[PDB]
Amino acid sequence: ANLNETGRVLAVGDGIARVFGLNNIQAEELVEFSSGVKGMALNLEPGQVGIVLFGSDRLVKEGELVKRTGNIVDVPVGPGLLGRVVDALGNPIDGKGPIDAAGRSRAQVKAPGILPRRSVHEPVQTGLKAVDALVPIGRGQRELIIGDRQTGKTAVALDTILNQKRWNNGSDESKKLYCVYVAVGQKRSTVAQLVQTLEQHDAMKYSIIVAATASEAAPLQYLAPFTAASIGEWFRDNGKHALIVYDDLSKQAVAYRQLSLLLRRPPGREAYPGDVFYLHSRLLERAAKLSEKEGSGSLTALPVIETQGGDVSAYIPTNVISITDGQIFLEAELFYKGIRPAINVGLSVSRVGSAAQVKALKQVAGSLKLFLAQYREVAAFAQSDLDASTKQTLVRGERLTQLLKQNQYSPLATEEQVPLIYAGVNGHLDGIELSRIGEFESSFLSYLKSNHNELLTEIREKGELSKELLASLKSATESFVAT
Amino acid sequence: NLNETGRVLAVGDGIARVFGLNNIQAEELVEFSSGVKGMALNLEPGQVGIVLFGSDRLVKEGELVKRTGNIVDVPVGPGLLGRVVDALGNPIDGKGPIDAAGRSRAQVKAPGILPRRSVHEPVQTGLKAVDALVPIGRGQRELIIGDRQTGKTAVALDTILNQKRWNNGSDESKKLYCVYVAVGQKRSTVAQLVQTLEQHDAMKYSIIVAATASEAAPLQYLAPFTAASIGEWFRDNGKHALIVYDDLSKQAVAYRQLSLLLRRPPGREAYPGDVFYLHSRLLERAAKLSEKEGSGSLTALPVIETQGGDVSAYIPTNVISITDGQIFLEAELFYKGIRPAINVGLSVSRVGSAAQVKALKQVAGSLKLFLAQYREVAAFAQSDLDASTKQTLVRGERLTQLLKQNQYSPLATEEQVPLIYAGVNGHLDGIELSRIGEFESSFLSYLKSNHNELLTEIREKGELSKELLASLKSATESFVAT
Amino acid sequence: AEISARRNAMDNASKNAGDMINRYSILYNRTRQAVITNELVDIITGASS
Amino acid sequence: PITGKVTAVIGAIVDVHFEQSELPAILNALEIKTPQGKLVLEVAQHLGENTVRTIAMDGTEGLVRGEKVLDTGGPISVPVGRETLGRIINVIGEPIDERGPIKSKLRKPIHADPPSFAEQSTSAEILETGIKVVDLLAPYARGGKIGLFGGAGVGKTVFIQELINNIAKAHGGFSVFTGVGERTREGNDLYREMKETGVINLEGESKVALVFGQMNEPPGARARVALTGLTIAEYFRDEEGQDVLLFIDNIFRFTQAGSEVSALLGRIPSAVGYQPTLATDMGLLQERITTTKKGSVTSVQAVYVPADDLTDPAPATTFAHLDATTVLSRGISELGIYPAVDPLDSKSRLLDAAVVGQEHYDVASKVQETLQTYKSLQDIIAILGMDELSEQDKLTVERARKIQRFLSQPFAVAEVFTGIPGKLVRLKDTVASFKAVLEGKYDNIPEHAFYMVGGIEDVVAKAEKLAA
Numbered sequence A: 001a002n003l004n005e006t007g008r009v010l011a012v013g014d015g016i017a018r019v020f021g022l023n024n025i026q027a028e029e030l031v032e033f034s035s036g037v038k039g040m041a042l043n044l045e046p047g048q049v050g051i052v053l054f055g056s057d058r059l060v061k062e063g064e065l066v067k068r069t070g071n072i073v074d075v076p077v078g079p080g081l082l083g084r085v086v087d088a089l090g091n092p093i094d095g096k097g098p099i100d101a102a103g104r105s106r107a108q109v110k111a112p113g114i115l116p117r118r119s120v121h122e123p124v125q126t127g128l129k130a131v132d133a134l135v136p137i138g139r140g141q142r143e144l145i146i147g148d149r150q151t152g153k154t155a156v157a158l159d160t161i162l163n164q165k166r167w168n169n170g171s172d173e174s175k176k177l178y179c180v181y182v183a184v185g186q187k188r189s190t191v192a193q194l195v196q197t198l199e200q201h202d203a204m205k206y207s208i209i210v211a212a213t214a215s216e217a218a219p220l221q222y223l224a225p226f227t228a229a230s231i232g233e234w235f236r237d238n239g240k241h242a243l244i245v246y247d248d249l250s251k252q253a254v255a256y257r258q259l260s261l262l263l264r265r266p267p268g269r270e271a272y273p274g275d276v277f278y279l280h281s282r283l284l285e286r287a288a289k290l291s292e293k294e295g296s297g298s299l300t301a302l303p304v305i306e307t308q309g310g311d312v313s314a315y316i317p318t319n320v321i322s323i324t325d326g327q328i329f330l331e332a333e334l335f336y337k338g339i340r341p342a343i344n345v346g347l348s349v350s351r352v353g354s355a356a357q358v359k360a361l362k363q364v365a366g367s368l369k370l371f372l373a374q375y376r377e378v379a380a381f382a383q384s385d386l387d388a389s390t391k392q393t394l395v396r397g398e399r400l401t402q403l404l405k406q407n408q409y410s411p412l413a414t415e416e417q418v419p420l421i422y423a424g425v426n427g428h429l430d431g432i433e434l435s436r437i438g439e440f441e442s443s444f445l446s447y448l449k450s451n452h453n454e455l456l457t458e459i460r461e462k463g464e465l466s467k468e469l470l471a472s473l474k475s476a477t478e479s480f481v482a483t
Numbered sequence B: 001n002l003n004e005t006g007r008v009l010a011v012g013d014g015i016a017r018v019f020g021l022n023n024i025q026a027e028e029l030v031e032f033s034s035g036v037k038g039m040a041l042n043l044e045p046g047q048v049g050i051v052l053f054g055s056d057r058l059v060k061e062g063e064l065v066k067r068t069g070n071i072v073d074v075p076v077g078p079g080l081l082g083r084v085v086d087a088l089g090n091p092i093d094g095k096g097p098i099d100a101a102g103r104s105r106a107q108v109k110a111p112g113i114l115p116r117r118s119v120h121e122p123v124q125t126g127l128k129a130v131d132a133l134v135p136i137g138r139g140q141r142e143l144i145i146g147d148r149q150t151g152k153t154a155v156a157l158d159t160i161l162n163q164k165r166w167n168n169g170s171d172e173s174k175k176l177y178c179v180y181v182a183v184g185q186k187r188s189t190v191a192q193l194v195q196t197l198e199q200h201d202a203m204k205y206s207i208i209v210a211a212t213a214s215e216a217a218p219l220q221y222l223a224p225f226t227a228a229s230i231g232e233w234f235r236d237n238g239k240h241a242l243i244v245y246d247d248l249s250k251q252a253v254a255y256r257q258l259s260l261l262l263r264r265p266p267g268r269e270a271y272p273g274d275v276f277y278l279h280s281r282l283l284e285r286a287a288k289l290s291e292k293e294g295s296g297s298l299t300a301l302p303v304i305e306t307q308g309g310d311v312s313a314y315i316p317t318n319v320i321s322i323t324d325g326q327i328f329l330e331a332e333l334f335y336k337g338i339r340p341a342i343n344v345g346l347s348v349s350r351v352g353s354a355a356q357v358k359a360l361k362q363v364a365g366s367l368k369l370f371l372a373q374y375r376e377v378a379a380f381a382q383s384d385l386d387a388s389t390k391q392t393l394v395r396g397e398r399l400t401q402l403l404k405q406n407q408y409s410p411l412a413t414e415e416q417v418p419l420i421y422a423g424v425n426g427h428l429d430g431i432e433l434s435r436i437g438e439f440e441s442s443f444l445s446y447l448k449s450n451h452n453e454l455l456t457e458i459r460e461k462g463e464l465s466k467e468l469l470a471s472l473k474s475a476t477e478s479f480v481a482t
Numbered sequence C: 001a002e003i004s005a006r007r008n009a010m011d012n013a014s015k016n017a018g019d020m021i022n023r024y025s026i027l028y029n030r031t032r033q034a035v036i037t038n039e040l041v042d043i044i045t046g047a048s049s
Numbered sequence D: 001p002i003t004g005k006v007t008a009v010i011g012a013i014v015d016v017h018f019e020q021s022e023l024p025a026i027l028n029a030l031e032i033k034t035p036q037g038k039l040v041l042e043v044a045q046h047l048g049e050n051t052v053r054t055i056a057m058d059g060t061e062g063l064v065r066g067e068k069v070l071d072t073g074g075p076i077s078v079p080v081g082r083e084t085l086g087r088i089i090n091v092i093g094e095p096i097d098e099r100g101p102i103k104s105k106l107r108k109p110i111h112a113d114p115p116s117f118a119e120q121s122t123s124a125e126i127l128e129t130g131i132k133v134v135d136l137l138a139p140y141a142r143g144g145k146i147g148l149f150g151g152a153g154v155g156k157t158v159f160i161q162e163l164i165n166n167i168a169k170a171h172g173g174f175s176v177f178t179g180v181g182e183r184t185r186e187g188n189d190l191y192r193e194m195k196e197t198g199v200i201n202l203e204g205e206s207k208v209a210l211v212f213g214q215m216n217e218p219p220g221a222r223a224r225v226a227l228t229g230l231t232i233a234e235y236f237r238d239e240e241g242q243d244v245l246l247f248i249d250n251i252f253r254f255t256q257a258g259s260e261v262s263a264l265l266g267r268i269p270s271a272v273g274y275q276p277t278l279a280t281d282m283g284l285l286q287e288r289i290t291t292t293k294k295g296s297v298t299s300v301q302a303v304y305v306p307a308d309d310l311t312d313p314a315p316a317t318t319f320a321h322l323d324a325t326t327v328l329s330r331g332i333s334e335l336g337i338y339p340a341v342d343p344l345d346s347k348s349r350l351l352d353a354a355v356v357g358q359e360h361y362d363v364a365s366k367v368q369e370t371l372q373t374y375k376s377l378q379d380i381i382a383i384l385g386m387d388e389l390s391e392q393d394k395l396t397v398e399r400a401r402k403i404q405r406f407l408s409q410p411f412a413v414a415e416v417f418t419g420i421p422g423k424l425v426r427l428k429d430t431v432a433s434f435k436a437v438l439e440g441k442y443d444n445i446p447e448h449a450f451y452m453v454g455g456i457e458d459v460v461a462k463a464e465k466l467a468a
C-alpha cells in the first residue's frame, strides 16, 4: 500500500527497470531490489520511475519489490581505504575484510569554483626525463595521456605512482601524494598483476585501487571514475595531496554510449550522446588545487585516452583535450623504433606546469621543447644535401632523444636529470658514440655519487641553481669526458 | 469465428494488417476475398501482419481473409524439367499444369554435419579459365561476383550450356540438372534467356524460377528458397543439380522491402538483422551428401553484384563469407578484350584441387604459377628487360590470350588439356600473339583427324600416361613445326 | 652518374609514396567507417518517428 | 511446471505470456515442443503485463499464437565432464552426432560468473605448447587468449589438433573446440579429420569435445554457442582442476551474431552498426577464460579482420583481450616451412625478460633480430648476389637460414598424413637449441639437418645420416 519507500517492477530490459510507485523517491537516489541488486533512479515521470541497474538484468524480475535507500549514489571515503582494492560502490573485493571509512561522499559532488582555487605550483615528480623536463605536471593540474594501444600509457602512469615512494616514505606531510587508480573497462587479470607490481614496489600501502573490469555492468564502469573522484577528493579537502588516474576515459565513454543508446537518446558523432563531453568535463573539474584558505589540498587527474590509428582529431580525444590542462601524446611510430617513453614533442604540451616545474631543470633546459619539436620537421627533410648548419644541430637532437630514453621502472630524481640535460644542451657528449649514450648515463652517475656528492645534495635541498653550482658542475662534466 | 478467418484492419504498400486468424501458423499462406494470396510474417497480439503477392488495389479495409493452413510449399520433381515457373511453382510458359512428384516447403533444414561427404566430382563448365584455374566441385558453393555488365550471367549460362555432354548421355551419376533462379529481371530478358537455352537444346534439363522486376517483393524473396527445394529433390534422390541465383543482391533488396514495410527495425543500409541468416540458410542447403544419403549433390552459383567494385559493401560481405570462393569479374579486363573477364588473382575455390579433372590439374599446376609471376612483372611492359623477366612476359600474354573464349562455345575437357598443354610447356612462345586465335581452332581440328585416339584416352581415362605425355608432346611439336 | 642518380631518386619516391599510401589507407578506413555510421543514423532517426 | 502462451511471433523473436509472478528471469530457457523435438527460446526482457520477450534458438515457422511454452527454470544448460569427449553437441546441449544422448552426471548453465578478483592469478605464466616457433617467439599465456590468424592453405586445423594433442600429452588437460558461425562443410571435414588423426577415438578415448553452431542456425544460436562450449571447458578447470584448451572459431562471427541479436531486439546500433553492448558482451565471454587457483583455461581464437581494418570496432575490441597472436602465413608454407607460423608477425605480449626469464628472452630477441637483418637483405641478394655483404653480415645470413629451417617442426597429428615421426619439443630444448646455434656452434653442419627435426640432438643424429 505505502508505495513511498517501495515500488514494484513493471518491466525490466536492456539494463533498465521501470518501477511503479516509489512516490517519495528523489532523482539520482539509490534503490535495492528483491535480490539485493542496486539500481539508481534516473528519471521520474508521472506513474513510473526509470531505474538503471548496477548489474545483470537476470537478477531482477517484473513484479519484484523495490526499496529506497534515501542515499544518493555514494561511497566510503577517508584514510582507511589505502592499500585496499574496491569496486564502483566502494565494496571491498580484495577480501581483506570490510572497508574502513571516515564517512561517505556522494559520487556526484560539484567542482570547487572560481574562488576557492589557487594556481598550481608544486611539481609532481614523475621521474621521467622526457616528462619532467618537457611536459611537467603540477599538483592540481589535470594532464592527459593519449596514445594508441600498446604505447606505454599505463607505463607512464604506473611509473609516477612508483616514484612517489621517495616522498611518501618520510616525515614530511606536505611532500606526500597518495595514488588512486581507477581501472575502467580493464581485465581482471590485468588488474591483479597491476596490484602485484604495486605491492612488489610497496606502493600499495599508500594507494587505493577502484576497478570496474570489462565484465561488470555498464553503469558500474560509468560510475567508477566518479566514485574514485570522491575517494581522492577526501585528501584534497583535508589539506593533503592525492593523484587520481583515470584508466581509461575512452572505455568509460564507451560504457556511457551503452546506457545512452539503451535509453534511446539520439547518437551524435561516432554514435555518442551529445553529453559525452559533460561526462568528462564534470569529472576532471574536480582534480584541482585549492587556495590557502581551504587548506591547499590538491588532486591530480591523469586520465588516459586511447586513440585509433594515431587519431588525435577524434571526437572523444578532442573533448578530453579541450577539458584537460594539456596532453602527453604517445606516438606508436617512435615506440616501434624502440624510443621509450615515445613522447611526440610537437603534440604533447603541459599548459600550466612550465611554471610548476622544479627550477633547477627549467634553468638547464632552456627552450628544449620547440628545439626538439622543430628538430623533428628538419630531420624529416633529409631523406637532400650536406648542410653543416642544420647538420651540426642534428648531432644534438639525436643524442638528446637518445638521452630521454628511459627503461621501464626507472624513476630518476631531479638532481640526476639536471646534469644530463646540462651535457645535453651544452653538448658535452657529442664526441661520445651514439650507442654509448644511454650506457654513459650509468657511468656518469657512478662518477657523481661519490665525488660531487654535494651538487646532488644541494639541488635536492634547494631545487634551485646559483651561478655557484653552474661552474661547480661544469668541472664535473668535461672531467668525465676525458676520464 | 476468427480462428480460421480474419478481417483486414488496414492495407497499403503491399502490406495488410488483419484482425483475428487466431490459429494461423507463422509463414502460413493466406487468401483474401478478392483472390490475391499473401503470407503472414508478423504474428502480433491483436493482429496479423500479412505481405501481399499481388496488387493491393485488390484488397480493401474490412475484407474477409481465409487461412489456407499451409506453409509455403512448391511442387518438386522431374516433371518440372524444361519448364518456366514463377516462385510458387506456377507455370508461366503456356505449357499446362506441372506434373509434381510431390511438394516441398520453401524452408528446409540444411543437411547437417553428419550426412555430407567431401566434394570430389567436377562441375565442368567448359570455360578454360574457370575449369583450369578456378575448379568447381559438385556440392560446392562458388560465387560469381562483379560490377554490372561484366559477364556474370555468361559464366553461369556457359556452365548450363556445357552439360549436354552428359545430360544427353545415359549415366545418371554423370548428368547435371540446371536450375536458374531469375530475380527481379526484366521479363524480356528471361524470355530471351529461355530463347537461348532452347537454341542450344539446354532447356530440356533446366528449370527457370522467375521472379521478374515487377512482381510482389515476397515472390522475389521466396523464389530462391522455392527453387532451392526444387534442387534438393535431385540431391535427395541420388542425382545432381546445380543452381544459379541471379541474383542474391536483388533478393536482399526484396527482403528489405518487406521488413521496412512491416516496420521491422533496420541496421546497416536498412537491412534487418537476419539478412545474413537469410543467405546462410539458402546456401548452406547446397551440399555433397554421403553414401548413405544416395550420394546426391547440389552445387550453387549465387550471383552477387558489386557497386564500383565494393566487396566490403554490406551484402557482398555476408555472401563472400558464406561461399567456398568467388569467380571475379572486372570491366577493365573486359574492355581489354579478356573474356571471360576473370580476375585470376582475386578468384579462389576453397574446394579447389579436389574437384578437377585429374588431367587438367596435371597440365596446369604450373598455370597458376606462371600467371602469378606474370602479374608481378606486368608493369615492365614499358624497353630494357633481362631475358628472364622478358620470358615471363612472353608466356603471360600468350597464356592470357589462350583463356579468351567466345560466348556460348564451352570446350570439352579433352579439348582444353591440349591447348593448356602446348601453352604451359612453351610451344606458343614462338607463335605471335595475334595468331593464338586461329591456333586453337586449327590445332583441335587437326588433333581430331590425326590424333583422335589420344583425345579419346583423355576423355575416357581422365588422366595422362607417361606415354600420353609423349604422345601429346609429339603431336604438338609436329603441329607447331607445321 | 645520371643513371645512378635516377636510380636513387626513383628509389626515394617509392619510399615516400610508400609512406603516403600508409597514411591515406588509415584515412580511408576512418571515412569508410563514418560513412557507415552517419548513413545509419539517417535511417534510425527516420525510423523512430 | 510453469506454463505460458505464445502471443507474438516475429522472425527469431517470440513473445510469451504468463501467470502472476511466475515469469522466468531473463536468460532463461523456455521450451516449445515441436513435431521434430524441441524449439528453445531465450528470454531477453520482461515487457510488463506478465509478458516476456524471447529470442529463438532455431526457426519459428509454424508457430501458432497461444501455444504451450514450458519454463526450464534455468538458463540453457549443457552436459559436462568426461562424457562429452568425442561428442558433437549443439548450442542447446544436445547430441548432434547420432550416437545417443550424452550421459553426463551434471548439467551447467551456459551463462555464469567470471572468477572473482579474489580467485585471480597474481602472476602471468607461460603455457608450454611444444611447438618451437610458438614457445620461443610467441609463447602462450597460461589461462591467456591467443588470436590465431590466417585462412586456408596454412594447415590451421592440423596445427589446432597439434595443440589439442600436446596440451593433452605434455600437460594433461583436455580441449574443447567450438565452431561459431561454422561453415557446415568444414564441420564435416574437421570431424572426419579429427577421427582420422585420432584425437577423437570412438573406440578408445578422445582429447576434445566438439560444440558446433553453424551459419544456417539463427542469430540467438550463433551468439550462445561460444558460452555453450566455454561452459564445458570451465568444468575441466574447476571440477578436475586442469589446464584446458578452449578453441573458438571464429570469435569474430560471435561478434557479428551478437549484432544481429541487437538489431532484431530493436535496440539502436552503436558506432559502425555494432551492438551498443559490444564491449561488455566480449567481457562476459572473455572474463570466464582465465587462470584460477584450481587450474586454467587457455583459448585459441580464430580472428577475422573486417575490410582489413584493425581499427574496426570488432577486432579493436577483441585485441583488448588477446595476450599473443599466432599468425600462420602463405609465404611461410610456400617456403616449405611447417608449421606455417610467421616467426616475425606472431607476437606474444608475454615475451618479456622479467616473465620468461633472461636467457629465454635474450635468445628470442636476437633470433628475431637475426631474422630481421636477413629479411631486409633478401633484396640486395637478388640484384648483386651474396658477393655484396661484409664479414659479419654474410655470417648471420648463412645462419638465419638454419634458424628459419629449425623453426619448422614435424607434428605427431600429421603422422597419418605424412608418415614422418612427429616431435614435441620441451621448452628448455627450444631455448638451449636456438642458443647454441646463435653463437655459431653448428656452422659446419649443413642446412637440411635443421629442417623437420626435434631438438638439437635430432639435428646431430640426422646430419650423420646426411654425412656418411
Ligand SMILES: Nc1ncnc2c1ncn2[C@@H]1O[C@H](COP(=O)(O)OP(=O)(O)NP(=O)(O)O)[C@@H](O)[C@H]1O
Binding pocket: A147, A148, A149, A150, A151, A152, A153, A154, A155, A156, A306, A340, A341, A406, A407, A408, D352
Ligand atoms: N619505457 C619503456 N621501456 C621498456 N618497455 C616499456 C616502456 N614503456 C612500456 N613498455 C612495455 O610495453 C608494453 C606496453 O605497456 P603499457 O603500459 O600497457 O602501454 P599501453 O599504451 O597502456 N598498452 P595498453 O594499456 O594494453 O593499451 C608494456 O607491456 C611494457 O612492458
Ligand SMILES: Nc1ncnc2c1ncn2[C@@H]1O[C@H](COP(=O)(O)OP(=O)(O)NP(=O)(O)O)[C@@H](O)[C@H]1O
Binding pocket: B147, B148, B149, B150, B151, B152, B153, B154, B155, B339, B340, B341, B405, B406, B407
Ligand atoms: N566471353 C564473352 N565473349 C564475348 N562477349 C561476352 C562474353 N561474356 C559476356 N559477353 C557479353 O558481354 C555483355 C555482359 O555479359 P553479361 O552476362 O550480361 O554480364 P552480367 O553481369 O550478367 N551483366 P548484367 O547481369 O545484365 O548487369 C553481354 O552483353 C554479352 O553479350
Ligand SMILES: [Mg+2]
Binding pocket: A153, A154, A155
Ligand atoms: Mg594500459
Ligand SMILES: [Mg+2]
Binding pocket: B152, B153, B154
Ligand atoms: Mg546478368
